[PDB]
Scaffold this active site. Structure first.
Site, PDB file in Angstrom:
ATOM      1  N   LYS A  83      -3.655  12.145  -9.099  1.00  0.00           N
ATOM      2  CA  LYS A  83      -3.386  10.711  -9.011  1.00  0.00           C
ATOM      3  C   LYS A  83      -3.495  10.121 -10.417  1.00  0.00           C
ATOM      4  O   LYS A  83      -4.475  10.360 -11.122  1.00  0.00           O
ATOM      5  CB  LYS A  83      -4.406  10.028  -8.088  1.00  0.00           C
ATOM      6  CG  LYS A  83      -4.163  10.223  -6.605  1.00  0.00           C
ATOM      7  CD  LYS A  83      -3.645   8.936  -5.956  1.00  0.00           C
ATOM      8  CE  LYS A  83      -3.489   9.094  -4.442  1.00  0.00           C
ATOM      9  NZ  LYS A  83      -4.789   9.357  -3.740  1.00  0.00           N
ATOM     10  N   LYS A  92       7.718  10.652   5.770  1.00  0.00           N
ATOM     11  CA  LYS A  92       6.522  10.258   6.519  1.00  0.00           C
ATOM     12  C   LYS A  92       6.985   9.638   7.822  1.00  0.00           C
ATOM     13  O   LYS A  92       7.837   8.740   7.820  1.00  0.00           O
ATOM     14  CB  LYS A  92       5.692   9.243   5.746  1.00  0.00           C
ATOM     15  CG  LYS A  92       4.997   9.822   4.549  1.00  0.00           C
ATOM     16  CD  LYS A  92       4.087   8.802   3.901  1.00  0.00           C
ATOM     17  CE  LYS A  92       3.455   9.385   2.667  1.00  0.00           C
ATOM     18  NZ  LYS A  92       2.493   8.452   2.042  1.00  0.00           N
TER      19      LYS A  92
END
EC number: 5.1.1.20
Length: 318
Positions: free
Chosen positions: A148, A244
């Site tokens: 990240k 998703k």
């Protein structure tokens, strides 16, 4: 007529291990085709204008039609892609598989491997901290690390991490925090370090700069990719799309998106939101089609459903 059903809709806020803020809010839908129960879960996506109230309202709005026997094919035309349709579409798939005494995988007719490599998150921190974390997670079994990153210390962080886990497969989630200015040089650095993929570096509503340079590594669309409808816009800006179910609005669209995306030259990735094992199970059918699987959402919850899917550092055991 030939298929009468009962619908139960309820909201669940599952606690998280560490500070959604402190809890993963999900909406569950249980369908009943006499004796056989179909269960579908979803996670309202704040960033797209959904809340538990908002999604529950959409589901109720179609409860009457769900009782007369609303099929999955008919559901695609009633509700728009989003968390609401996801819960219903998944609930219908669950019901359609149990009514044939088969596993979702067999109903579709795909084979699920025994072990699935899932991305382990290496959270933001100083170069040193991110490197130690990457090393520990690599030691614990994680072959795929999702680093990240924000807009700070991009070079040292990635350098210290790669130096620590020279053999780890690395993907970067810049999570819309990067900018046009210098985006190319940055992608170039990720390439120098063997980064397999860079995910959504620019805001979904301002990612044009992605057409102004030859990508040194595959760049994946996340917030910019919902359904097949965005595929046109994405062409020329991204090499990969992150699928998703909450964004595609169910497994049905996800599957058609996978097929359709591939056909247009896109590579695939399977993602998830914070959820219980119920949501991951509903997404599994896509696993054999994707380059990366980021399905550890359940591990972020203090507790999970019972029974739950078995997760070990970097792995999902089926």
């Amino acid at each position: 007529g030939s298929h009468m059903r009962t619908v139960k809709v309820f909201e669940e806020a599952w606690p998280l291990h560490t500070p959604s803020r402190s809890e993963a809010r999900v909406v569950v839908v249980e369908l009943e085709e006499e004796g056989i129960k179909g269960t579908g879960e979803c996670t309202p996506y704040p960033r797209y204008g959904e809340s538990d109230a908002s999604v529950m309202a959409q589901i109720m709005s179609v409860v009457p039609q769900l009782e007369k026997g609303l099929t999955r094919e008919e559901l695609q035309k009633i509700l728009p892609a989003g968390a609401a349709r996801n819960a219903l579409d998944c609930a219908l798939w669950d019901l359609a598989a149990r009514r044939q005494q088969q596993s979702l995988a067999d109903l579709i007719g795909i084979t699920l491997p025994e072990t699935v490599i899932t991305a382990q998150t290496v959270v933001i921190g100083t170069p040193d901290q991110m490197a130690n974390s990457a090393s520990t997670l690599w030691q614990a079994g994680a072959k795929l690390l999702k680093v990240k990153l924000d807009n700070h210390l991009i070079s040292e962080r990635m350098v210290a991490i790669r130096t620590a886990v020279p053999d780890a497969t690395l993907i970067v989630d810049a999570n819309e925090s990067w900018r046009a200015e210098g985006l190319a040089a940055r992608c170039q650095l990720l390439a120098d370090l063997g980064v397999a993929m860079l995910e959504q570096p620019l805001p979904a509503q301002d990612d044009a700069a992605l057409e102004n340079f030859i990508h040194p590594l595959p760049i994946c669309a996340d917030e910019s990719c919902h359904t097949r409808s965005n595929l046109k816009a994405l062409k020329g800006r991204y090499e990969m799309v992150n699928i998703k179910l909450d964004k595609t609005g169910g497994l049905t669209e996800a599957l058609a998106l996978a097929t359709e995306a591939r056909a247009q030259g896109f590579s695939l990735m399977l993602g998830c939101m914070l959820c219980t094992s119920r949501a991951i199970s509903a997404a599994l059918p896509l696993v054999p089609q994707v380059s990366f699987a980021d399905l550890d959402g359940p591990t972020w919850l203090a507790v999970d459903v019972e029974p739950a899917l078995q997760f070990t550092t970097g792995e999902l055991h089926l």
